[PDB]
Amino acid sequence: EEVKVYGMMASPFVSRVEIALKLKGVEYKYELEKFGNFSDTLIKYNPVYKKVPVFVHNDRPISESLVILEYIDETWKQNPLLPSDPYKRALVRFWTKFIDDKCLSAARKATFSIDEKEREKGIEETEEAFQILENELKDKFFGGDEIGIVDIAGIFIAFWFPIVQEATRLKLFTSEKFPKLHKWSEDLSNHPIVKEILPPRESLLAYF
Amino acid sequence: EEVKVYGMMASPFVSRVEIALKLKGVEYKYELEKFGNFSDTLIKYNPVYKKVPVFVHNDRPISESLVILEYIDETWKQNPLLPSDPYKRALVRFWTKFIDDKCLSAARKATFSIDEKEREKGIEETEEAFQILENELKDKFFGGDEIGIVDIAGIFIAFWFPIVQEATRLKLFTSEKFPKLHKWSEDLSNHPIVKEILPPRESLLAYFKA
């Protein structure tokens, strides 16, 4: 009967839950939370981290985002996210690990300045440590022809990353340096439902 | 026929695979690795992370350690390691995730010095944020009646951490502070399996004091 999400206006983690949940064809109340100090009924549901996205249904919570994704894929078996073969499903998880390791690309092209920035290099390796292994324009994108988990796990690349370099004024991400997955970023655009769960394009530019 | 693990002589992660791999009643050839710079036929199997344990069988590698445990459960299903219900299957993975999310806590107050030591205090919260929520002297240890996945993910507590403090001369870990899980630490001693892939304790004690 009941299915309840806890999250903010623009967390890429709260996004990765909603998309997965929305492809499933599942309804969901959405209750917002404060950027700073949160509510109590959520901190009761994640007293450990006190972090969104927290996902509950019939009052039973599931904290942390990458574990939520793997819950919903084997509860509603409409539009599978994860591969069906135990080995390629094992490979697929190895990449969501890597996408989570890669996220440290955001923590260096966003929240730094001056010299403490260019004590960096990793992002350029990851994008190559990407493309050159995954293949998302020789055939479709990641997990089969439609949206897989690795796609959703990397939406802070497909959408949020293009919109952040306008805090470093950087042009790392372009069809001259990383062509194979710049056209993959199109993941942002398509899907007449994913097509919102993502906020407006120009509004976010203001925030950075 | 063939099944291969690649790793070092006493990595807590390489232990974490082998026990899991052992419970199922599965053989495994074992190839050792260089403390410093590694071989090529391993980095051909793990060009991305370049850290053991790398696990292969029928030439098909699986790098990264917590995913290997979940691989062995799904083709070799005798005494299942993961829960059957999608919720507790989510929690048990939610718990491996926390144990591994914390892990820089164990490596904080152990192999560091001066200020960066007592700049930790997370260990004492997590160790309480362990037993104050686990409550597994109520029944067995973690996941069900036999060894469950959450246990193996936290073997760097059950074995290494007890050893590892007598380099900073710390006494954080005692049965007086964490009784539900100090008595759990005897997961190592009990159980005819965790026993043997775990090296000697007194040999290991020598390594850290150096």
Q: Which of A31, A57, A84 is the last residue of a domain?
A: A84
Residue A76 zone, left/alpha/beta (φ > 0; ψ -120 to 50; rest): beta
How many angstroms away from the CA of A89 is the closest CA of chain B? 9
> Are residues A93 and A78 both part of a single domain?
no
> Are residues B92 and B80 both part of a single domain?
no
Q: How far is CA A117 from CA A64, A122, A128, A166, A172, in A?
A: 29, 11, 20, 15, 14
Q: How far is CA A43 from CA A31, A34, A84, A94, B63, in A?
A: 13, 12, 35, 30, 35
> Are residues B99 and B140 both part of a single domain?
yes
CATH number at residue B149: 1.20.1050.10
> Are residues B134 and B195 both part of a single domain?
yes
Q: How many domains does chain B have?
A: 2
Domain of A173?
Answer: 85-208
- Element (DSSP H or E) covering residue B54: strand B54-57
Interface test with B, best of A87, A133, A134 (most B CBs within 10 A): A87
**Among candidate residues A68, A54, A150, the one with its CA nearest the CA of residue A102:** A150
Tell me, in Å, the resolution of the deposited structure. 3.5
Terminal CA-CA length for chain A: 39
> Are residues B139 and B91 both part of a single domain?
yes
How many angstroms away from the CA of A3 is the closest CA of chain B? 14
> Are residues A107 and A161 both part of a single domain?
yes
Q: Which of A84, A118, A140 is the last residue of a domain?
A: A84
CB B97 within 8 A of CB A64: yes
- Element (DSSP H or E) covering residue A117: helix A114-118
Chain B residue whose CA is closest to A130: B48
> Are residues A51 and A119 both part of a single domain?
no
Interface test with B, best of A56, A67, A132 (most B CBs within 10 A): A67
For tokens 């950087």, the residue is A170
The experimental method is: X-ray
Scored b (16 or more CB within 10 A) or e, B29-63 reads eeeebeeeebeeebeebbebbebbbbbbbeeebbb
- Element (DSSP H or E) covering residue B19: helix B12-23
> Are residues A48 and A141 both part of a single domain?
no
Do the Cβ atoms of B67 and A94 come within 8 Å? yes
Do the Cβ atoms of A64 and B94 come within 8 Å? yes
What span, in angstroms and rounded, lies between the C-alpha atoms of A43 and A111?
27
> Are residues A164 and A123 both part of a single domain?
yes
> Are residues B39 and B113 both part of a single domain?
no
